[PDB]
Design a protein around this ligand. Sequence first.
Ligand code: NM0
Ligand code: NM0
Lengths: 304, 304
Amino acid sequence: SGFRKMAFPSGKVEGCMVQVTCGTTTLNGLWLDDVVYCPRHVICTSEDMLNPNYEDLLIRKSNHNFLVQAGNVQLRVIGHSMQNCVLKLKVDTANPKTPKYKFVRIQPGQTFSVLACYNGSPSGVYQCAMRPNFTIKGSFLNGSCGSVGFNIDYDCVSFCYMHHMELPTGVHAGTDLEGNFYGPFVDRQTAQAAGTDTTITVNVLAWLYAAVINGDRWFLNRFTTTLNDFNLVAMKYNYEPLTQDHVDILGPLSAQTGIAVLDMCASLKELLQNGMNGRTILGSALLEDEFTPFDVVRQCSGVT
Amino acid sequence: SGFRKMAFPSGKVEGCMVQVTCGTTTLNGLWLDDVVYCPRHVICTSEDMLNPNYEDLLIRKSNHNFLVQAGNVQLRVIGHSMQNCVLKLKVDTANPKTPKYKFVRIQPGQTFSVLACYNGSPSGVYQCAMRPNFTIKGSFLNGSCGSVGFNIDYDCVSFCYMHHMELPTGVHAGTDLEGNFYGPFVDRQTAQAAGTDTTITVNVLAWLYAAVINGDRWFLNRFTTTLNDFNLVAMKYNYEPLTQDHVDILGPLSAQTGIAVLDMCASLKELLQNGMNGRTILGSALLEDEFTPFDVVRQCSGVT
Ligand SMILES: O=C(Cc1cccc(Cl)c1)Nc1cnc2ccccn12
Ligand SMILES: O=C(Cc1cccc(Cl)c1)Nc1cnc2ccccn12
């Protein structure tokens, strides 16, 4: 028992982290096979970050201008190319520590682990969610760019995120491993609107089931609701509308606890309307939304 | 910016995890050099867990009865011995992935990362604190025994915890790597009192400084307090008394923010007496105590 914001073991990703320096800028890169991936803003100086012409900036750069270091060994750069907002530096040596991997574009509301890095060295690992507004509420300092987000399925690492920037609001933005930003963000030092975020309803319900599994049942009530009635409440509280797909995904948890999804929705409705009254659920005084139904099943079943 | 419950990168520890089976019981072991460490209850069956005579149970076991598997290779056991509540299985092969390591006995209120494992395979990593009452509020299922807690300082892994049991109350108990339990716990299936836990005051204050560093300042007030006055409030709210050693440890954070430790104590006093009024601090609706002053400095400075 117990329920924690658990990250995937980071070893397979630690073996891929490298340092990429171009001119005066140093950030993190991801070495997979004979390619190093990193944010394209590694080629910028602070002067041109206001409105960079990446194509023109990259033209002034040659293979020998990209210094890639893996631990204490230097990698030889034999090719460079820009794909969207990422640079792909072809190196002459395949990473011997390359795990089985995939590049995936995750959906908002899904979760992943982040290995925060500085100068190509890992500092920590934490679990987070891609917000419905495509931002992440991470923990990153200057130099963390190029740190990646990932999920692990047995021996396969699915890389889903590469860190690029911190908005003036303190939230984080980045891309998939093809360099496409999640959300409307651009890699320029300009004010950028993140847009209204919502609470991931399906994750809150998954977490309520995790609470029941781990003994926290004070919030269960004698009521039920309908999808339509619940969604009117979700609207008022900036919760994403619950759909039959979400109910279906919660099927396994509903079966394990014997609590119908709409009965759990009525518990959630009462919590939204009345608050927690000073009580906690799984050590939290707010409704947690950064655990998917899959995360709950994984943590409560012990998938390695 | 941003503040997360960040764990150490788990790679160096993943390389040490093995599966230990004795008879019908399988748990995790830690392979360092030519020794595998694991909880001594691996030699028990469910029948004798009520009141085990470990000395007598271990006598019926020989080296060949301990099956140690590292991934898919079997390790050859050439020696066994019991040290307190841990078994040390001498194997004929030194772990090639053994990191630079130390065994340390951490103090209550200190933090560490846990690599939860099942059948010798890592499933997740999370950060937690040793509670003042010597329990940990982890996330563990049956089979997680032998999973370890650790801290990393540059290239050195300081192992501080090995998981042994879950109390009927759902909290976790275990030992240092010499097999000495933290707290009054015994490795028997009997009801065991954990004792009154307190909130780690120095960690709450460290986290209040982390909030100020990251922009959350709504809780700062026009008041100050004394150690004696604050401690009367800490007493009422089951907070551990704050000492000059704790004030001293908060020195770096007080210097970075320019907020005197006793002024931060007055903010904490007002939060204890008046609650949060429905507001949050660093995404939390309660006062967080599982970040030490060292953790705050590390996360806010980017130590790799
Ligand atoms: O924000 C930037 C630089 C930058 C500016 C404008 C656009 C782009 Cl793509 C990059 N780096 C960064 C990443 N994460 C953090 C956390 C804190 C401070 C800085 N961080
Ligand atoms: O509690 C035990 C077995 C046991 C019983 C009595 C004493 C001792 Cl030392 C061990 N194993 C265990 C560890 N963590 C968990 C989580 C859940 C269920 C079981 N867990």
